[model samples]
Target: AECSVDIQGNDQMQFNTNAITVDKSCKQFTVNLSHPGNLPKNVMGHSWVLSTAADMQGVVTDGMASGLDKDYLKPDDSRVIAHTKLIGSGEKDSVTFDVSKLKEGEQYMFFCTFPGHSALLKGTLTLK
Candidate 1:
């Protein structure tokens, strides 16, 4: 089976998928994200950032301070497991990371770090 998944973001501050599963047999996993809307990055940018569920709030808080030029993510934040570049309408970005970063029983989450996007653009990720 393929070890990657695709997700989409829209102008409505929504992501197309909410749950992702990483196959344990895969050494690496990838997340492909696309923004199919018509807005520009500043107005409606999207990105995929992964972290432990418990760290979501803190990461998001720090990311908000980091600003959009940094893809709305804190530079060198260890809590971030993987992330895709921020993009706008008709653009896409992908991120690949070692599957070992995920623990079988741990709860993980992926979301866009845009100012208010996380509130509606977050989802769960699991190991299978």
Candidate 2:
């Protein structure tokens, strides 16, 4: 779908895409996350999490305090617009959300919620 994207998380703890634009035609959007390495979840788990630019730090900080069992994210975190489940090597997950919630000029952010993966796995998301 025009409103969907696929992202890859590798052994190096990085995301292949730096940014994504949601087409104006779709009512909802989807994000798929796949990790291809064989690393264990504890050492290199990956998850695709979305929020506004201003919420990045607060989300990541509070998320880190949550255990991996909670996918390293604060449960019921309103700041998070969408997110995939915890994924290890050879695993995959996806998230979908209403496009109406996204505004035209606001800055959106995407990143891995796992402890330290966001350092390099983070990126921008936009609607155009």
Candidate 3:
């Protein structure tokens, strides 16, 4: 089967899952996000960003300064491994990245870069 993950973000500032695992055999992996709330992107927008666990805090910190126009992320930030566009109520987005970018036993994290959402929308990702 193809390697992929499905996640949902709601107006309540929550993600459906806290962890994800990528199979070693997958050359590429996809993360699909759906927002089921009634809010708009400017208000309760959500996004999926991947990076090393150690870099997550820095990314989010700088992203806040980037503003919503940049999807709450630093422009052309090399620290970001992969990311999906910010979406709002009833919207969806996805991102695909080379599995080779991930290393076994390395700590990785995925989170929303929308302002304060990362506090509740972050999770761990691992390679199997």
Candidate 4:
């Protein structure tokens, strides 16, 4: 069976869920992101990006420089295992990545790299 996760980002720079667990039996994992607010992308946008916890800062830094045109992410960044495009109010996006890319016992993190959103928009991803 496949694994699927649904997360929501709000205008308060908050994520409804703080953690996610990926099932090892899954051949692939799907992340569905939604923004159920009324703000525009410039005012309040969100995205989902996955990487090793250690690489989060560096990836986010470079992503910030990449700006919104690049969906607040670096182009073809090897550190990013998966990501969804930025979405604004009432918008949504999703991304699916090979489960083989995940290693058991390794820690992963998911965050919104929309400038200062990381402070309140980050969470843990565990493969089980």
Candidate 5:
């Protein structure tokens, strides 16, 4: 089956959904990201980054240093499995990654690396 999901971020530093599922039968999975609020990127931007739950903090720390020009992500961080571009109000981005990269029973999370946003904008993902 083809696996697809949708996530929304708003000005309040919250994501509309907190969990997602990646189907093993899918060769690839897609995440549709949308920002429904009117806040600018500098104030309350959001992005979706996928990585092992264990590496969440480290990735966010390093990614923050990359700055917005790099979409708040490391130039070539190997630990990042997939990510959407940083976007402001009314903007949207999407990322599709190979399902083979996901392993069942392993812990995974999707979060926004927009400075302080991660504390409240993180969520979980399960692969089956």
Candidate 6:
């Protein structure tokens, strides 16, 4: 799991794991997301996104109406630090970001952007 981890999404609309930590030794970290269910993208797709905790609400809210084609994210949103493309069942996507962008005192969070999905599919990320 060095520098990256794989999170699983199922038809239940939830993630298999909830928290992640990045090692300072890594220049960059990656989040690898995969869907294990049989559901199609429209009915049960999922994406992995990261941002400061302060911006989580705004990113999720503004992106809600943006539609599936955009992976439910605001176009060119600066609040979103990094994210993977939306994936359906048996599909996968990964996002990598420079660890230097993560500041020492900020509370970082990662979540799924599917409509109403963040409530459960959310987790905290930290650098140590």
Alpha-carbon RMSD, each predicted model:
0.9, 0.9, 0.9, 1.2, 1.3, 0.9
lDDT of 6 by residue, 9-102 (tens): 8889778888889887889998888899999888787889899999999899987888996889998989998988888998999889999989
Worst 10 residues of 6 by lDDT: 13-22
* TM-scores for the candidates: 0.96, 0.96, 0.96, 0.96, 0.95, 0.95
**True-vs-predicted CA distance for residue 111, candidate 4, Å:** 0.2
**Number of backbone collisions per candidate:** 0, 0, 0, 0, 0, 0
**Overall lDDT per candidate, in order of appearance:** 0.91, 0.90, 0.93, 0.90, 0.90, 0.88
Q: Pick the candidate with the highest lDDT.
A: 3
lDDT of 4 by residue, 16-124 (tens): 8899989888898999999988899876879999999989999999988998899889999999999999899899998999999999998999999888787689999
What is the TM-score of candidate 1?
Answer: 0.96
The digit string of per-residue lDDT tens for model 2 on 1-128 reads: 57799899999867989999998777999998899998987889999889999999889998889988798999999999988988899999989999998989999999988887787999999988
Give me candidate 2's TM-score against the actual structure: 0.96
lDDT string, candidate 1, 48-86, tens digits: 999999999989999888888798899999999999988
Superposition error at 81 for model 2 (Å): 0.6
Off by over 4 Å in 3: none
Which of candidates 1 and 5 is the stronger one according to lDDT? Answer: 1
- Kindly indicate the candidate among 3 and 5 with the higher lDDT: 3
